[PDB]
Ligand binder design. Structure first.
Ligand SMILES: OC[C@H]1O[C@@H](O[C@H]2[C@@H](OC[C@H]3O[C@@H](O[C@H]4[C@H](O)[C@@H](O)[C@H](O[C@H]5[C@H](O)[C@@H](O)[C@H](O)O[C@@H]5CO)O[C@@H]4CO[C@H]4OC[C@@H](O)[C@H](O)[C@H]4O[C@@H]4O[C@H](CO)[C@H](O)[C@H](O)[C@H]4O)[C@H](O)[C@@H](O)[C@@H]3O[C@@H]3O[C@H](CO[C@H]4OC[C@@H](O)[C@H](O)[C@H]4O)[C@@H](O)[C@H](O)[C@H]3O)OC[C@@H](O)[C@@H]2O)[C@H](O)[C@@H](O)[C@H]1O
Ligand code: GDP
Ligand code: GDP
Ligand code: CL
Lengths: 450, 450
């Protein structure tokens, strides 16, 4: 099923985006099926987009409104921050567009169209380069005159022609009013919304009345939001897809089982660090993801091949594993090969291409280990429909104990959620209101769907 | 008993299997050699085993021969040649094979000084006996200090015209001189053939000059009707990795190489004070493998392909990393699927085990590129019966042009030959006497069998 149970629309040009349908030959089928209601929501979204998208008459008339009522409403996502952040925040803004009957338009930035194919059949999701507010995207912040929070603060609130929503991690109490029901009703009248964020803000949408009922219908399995919208939205270009297929076929395709180890060390020193090496071997072995080796001369008595796919900025962790499985027999007899695609040293177009391909490769494994706080790993696990084991975030360069725990769900984590009761107008722990929105396993104040 | 498991009669049957798994199992991992050992050679090795059983360490005969060393002048039942463990592993493997050939030509028993690790690396080669020099051999504590000035050095005696003896030290190290080189003269071999105990220190593959000695020439021609198979046969006969080293081979083969349709070996050695890696060496490898059609070009302007595995060995990982990137980043011109693998990056016990394992892994490839001057490469090509493509030694950090050329034959090179006409007692170019002994491709000073 190259259509993912109805999630994807047929009729795309194969050759211009090989990954779209051809990736069926590379993963196992997801056991999570999209709701019939979500499928209808997306087919109808594509009709709205054909009706209102760039190049249409309707879109031209709506531009003239920004400048000088209407039947077209929009939300523009600004390109900003690292790739993991961009994939997650873009999926969030898309969900928000579905909840508000808006058209999503994508600021291409430097490379989004170099990485990702078109997701909406017959139109394009890219904001035209001549959109007349493009020169202001960089400057837009909490002090912008059309920043919603800045307008609340100054108490400046007819209907505005447009509104900027500051949803970056450094946002304040006024910006956070975005997550309140009364504020959403006001914002819903504004034709043009511009969003900047580096967070996966999905979970808090489930706490806004009105949205909650719609979300219930869209995702009866509440923790499939990113798994469905992410696989629907993001398809690597042929350039990026080449890195995926060539690495898969050369190094991973002959394995009975594949284990992804997504290694991310939030430290200015590049390492590698012995305590992280120790965390990894500790985790994979105590969870029976990888076998022990032993030093007995007398051996006991066809073996499965396991490929270990390690992604990191530094290759020391994979080299450590490689050596160990080369130097010693496994206690179970299994055959273990360790593979790492790259060692880029730090974040830096070939670099973004490689990072996307590596997230994609991780999403092709059978069992996945990820690193606490890493959105690199959230993307991999979401696209793969994979519930990882999480390597907890170490303090004072001490190997955490326990070294890892299983995730509650495959969902990404919202790192900077609001902690606000809109009704009582006072603070509250938003991770203790409903059973399906809980604090994240890797970051105690984050939120995620379960 | 001319089973492929016995290398066509080269190996004797009857060895205990579990104590040396590599011995007969070598068959599962290589293809069979098209070079058949002559039945003359097979008879000579069986009869060498009878003599070794009669005269070997611990026998009543050995013990009786030890008493000849309890005096300056000595007729016994048994004569020996003792090899001193000296120099790097590639040097030791080749020199030991040369001394063994010399033992065969002089009806002598070979005893092997185990040094620090010969018995941790190699199994016993002579059915029913040990080839190790006993640890209480009277002269072992002299081995380190024997040299050209030693009173018992044959060359010293020749120089000072002071010539039966019970023993004689033969200095056959690369720094030897004109009087030591007299070893390679027929008249001197007649004197030497009288001495029951010879002690040899060498770091050279001295085989080729034995072919220029009357007497030996006739026997060599019967032993090796295909002249350039000397090391291929004796090396395969003598050297079998212990179980601990064989585990390095099999685990690496099974994890990384076993699914390939073709394997290309690239043995990289850079004789330079800096560790590198050097761009001009990368360019050389790239040029060599592409112009010789060993590895395909890539398309930078983009049904059932074959899987080709590239096995790179080097102290520095920079060359394999560069190849791996190029083949990941760009599609092959041919559609071939290319995987790049390097076992170790030693940088400069477990170490000697890995070096030996890496030599054997190279010896398992289908086509082999080697570095000029490198006995590491000589061993690997010899064990595999591979005629390599040689990367010429570069001067002044310039990529040579041509970058590589096919060897004249699979034989190793003798780096420090004598150039002396024994009969006319005068200098001569020993590389221009007989068609089957020529100057090496990679070092014009040396000689090889062709
Ligand atoms: O006793 C406390 C003590 O803490 C000391 O710091 C500790 C402590 O850190 C708490 C703090 O962490 C922030 O995350 C840091 C992280 O610690 C760093 O490791 C990391 O370093 C990066 C760096 O940013 C890079 O530029 C550099 O090159 O490399 C390093 C290492 O890889 O930086 C992050 C912050 O990065 C964000 O900000 C800077 C941007 O440049 C960057 O792009 C951006 O990253 C994005 O951040 C978002 C966040 O949503 C998301 O993760 C993206 O994926 C990512 O790309 C946290 O950001 C911050 O929240 C922590 O502060 C605590 O926050 C609590 C929750 O409040 C937030 O969420 C809810 C919302 O309602 C709030 O408005 C919002 O603020 C809060 O309750 C609490 O009071 C805060 O302390 O812990 C870990 C330890 O490692 C640190 O050393 C501190 O120095 C000391 O003074 C003292 O306070
Ligand atoms: N190729 C590659 N790039 C990485 C890796 N880890 C980190 N990076 C780079 O650093 C960035 C990390 O930022 P982001 O993607 O937002 O994820 P996060 O910072 O881990 O939450 C990545 O996007 C890459 O550019 C890796 O394993 N492989
Ligand atoms: N493991 C490993 N060791 C190497 C490699 N290249 C060189 N060495 C080390 O350096 C030594 C080189 O000396 P020798 O073996 O006599 O061969 P040569 O010096 O290349 O002629 C080897 O024995 C190894 O210990 C390599 O690719 N892998
Ligand atoms: Cl450390």
């Amino acid at each position: 099923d190259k259509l993912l149970g109805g999630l994807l629309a047929s009729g795309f040009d194969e050759d211009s985006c090989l990954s779209r349908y051809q990736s069926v030959h590379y993963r196992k089928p997801s056991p999570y099926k999209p709701s019939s209601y979500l499928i209808s929501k997306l087919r109808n979204y594509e009709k709205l987009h054909k009706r209102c998208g760039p190049g249409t008459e309707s879109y031209k008339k709506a531009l003239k409104q920004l400048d000088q009522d209407g039947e077209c409403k929009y939300v523009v996502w600004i390109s900003f921050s690292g790739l993991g952040n961009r994939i997650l925040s873009l999926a969030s803004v898309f969900l928000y567009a579905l909840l508000t009957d808006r058209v999503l338009l994508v600021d291409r930035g430097k490379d989004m169209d170099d990485l990702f194919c078109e997701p909406f059949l017959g139109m394009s999701w890219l904001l035209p380069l001549d959109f007349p507010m493009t020169d202001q995207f960089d400057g837009l912040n909490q002090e912008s005159s059309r920043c919603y929070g800045y307008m609340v603060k100054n108490q400046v609130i007819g209907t505005l022609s447009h509104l900027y929503l500051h949803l970056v991690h450094d946002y304040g109490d006024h910006d956070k009013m975005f997550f309140c029901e009364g504020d959403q009703t006001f914002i819903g009248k504004v034709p043009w919304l511009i969003v900047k964020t580096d967070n996966y803000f999905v979970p808090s949408l489930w706490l806004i009345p009105g949205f909650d009922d719609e979300l219930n219908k869209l995702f009866p399995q509440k923790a499939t939001v990113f798994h469905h919208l992410g696989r629907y939205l993001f398809h690597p270009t042929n350039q990026v897809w080449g890195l995926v297929t060539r690495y898969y076929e050369a190094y991973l395709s002959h394995a009975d089982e594949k284990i992804g180890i997504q290694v991310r060390v939030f430290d200015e020193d590049p390492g590698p660090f012995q305590h992280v090496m120790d965390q990894i071997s500790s985790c994979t072995q105590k969870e029976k993801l990888l076998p022990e080796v032993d030093t007995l001369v007398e051996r006991s008595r066809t073996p499965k091949h396991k490929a270990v796919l390690v992604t990191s900025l530094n290759a020391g962790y994979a080299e450590n594993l490689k050596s160990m499985y080369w130097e010693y027999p496994t206690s179970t007899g299994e055959i273990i090969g360790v593979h790492q695609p790259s060692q880029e040293g730090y974040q830096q177009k070939m670099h973004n291409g490689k990072a996307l391909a590596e997230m994609y490769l991780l999403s092709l494994t059978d069992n996945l280990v990820t690193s606490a706080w890493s959105t690199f790993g959230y993307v991999a696990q979401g696209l793969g429909g994979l519930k990882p084991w999480i390597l907890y975030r170490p303090e004072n360069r001490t190997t955490p104990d326990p070294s890892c725990g299983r995730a509650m769900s495959m969902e990404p984590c919202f790192h900077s959620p609001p902690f606000y009761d809109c009704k009582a107008k006072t603070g509250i722990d938003t991770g203790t209101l409903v059973p399906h929105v809980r604090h994240c396993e890797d970051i105690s104040w984050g939120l995620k769907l379960v």
